[PDB]
Amino acid sequence: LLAYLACEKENWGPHLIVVPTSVLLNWEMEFKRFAPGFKVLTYYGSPQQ
DNA sequence: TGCACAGGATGTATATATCTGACACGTGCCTGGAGACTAGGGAGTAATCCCCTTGGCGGTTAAAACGCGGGGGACAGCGCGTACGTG
């Protein structure tokens, strides 16, 4: 659906997912596996990183 | 002539009468001791409601705890001289 929004319209936008802490890496690995052309960030190291 | 002696001329602690100072006793007018009336402030109670607990599982995060390197600062040793101790 997010890859459909990039090709259907010109809206890309900064998106947001809310994942549990155990499946945090599977969405990044799935984002590199499926639909590579998206820029994805993650969230680790709350006080410093 | 050199020498001991008897009595006076001054001292000196000793005992006695005398001068302050503080403890002890005998009063009386501003205090207390006590009797009665008032009453409002203190002792007692009936809901109340409201924030304050009761007990313990996990997940995760930010704070607390440990560990080593070493660098610079506490700290000991020692000579000087002038600044207060002593007369």
Q: Nearest nt to A46, CA vs C1'?
A: B61
Lookup result for tokens 């998206």: A38
Name residue A21's amino acid.
T
How do the residues of chain A divide into helix, strand and coil, expressed in percent and rounded to 5? Answer: 35, 0, 65
Strand B: list protein residues with Cβ under 7 Å: A 21-22, 46-47
State how far Cα A47 lies from the chain centre: 22
> What kind of experiment solved this structure?
cryo-EM
d(CA A44, CA A49): 6
CB-based contact A3:A35 (threshold 8 Å): yes
In sequence order, which ranges of A1-49 are alpha helices (DSSP H)? Answer: 2-8, 24-33
For A10-22, letters b (16+ CB in 10 Å) and e give eeeeeeeeeeeee
Q: Give, as ranges, the nucleotides of chain B with any atom within 7 Å of a protein CB.
A: 59-63
Task: Write the CA distances from A35 to A2, A9, A24, A27, A49, integer angstroms.
Answer: 9, 17, 17, 11, 26
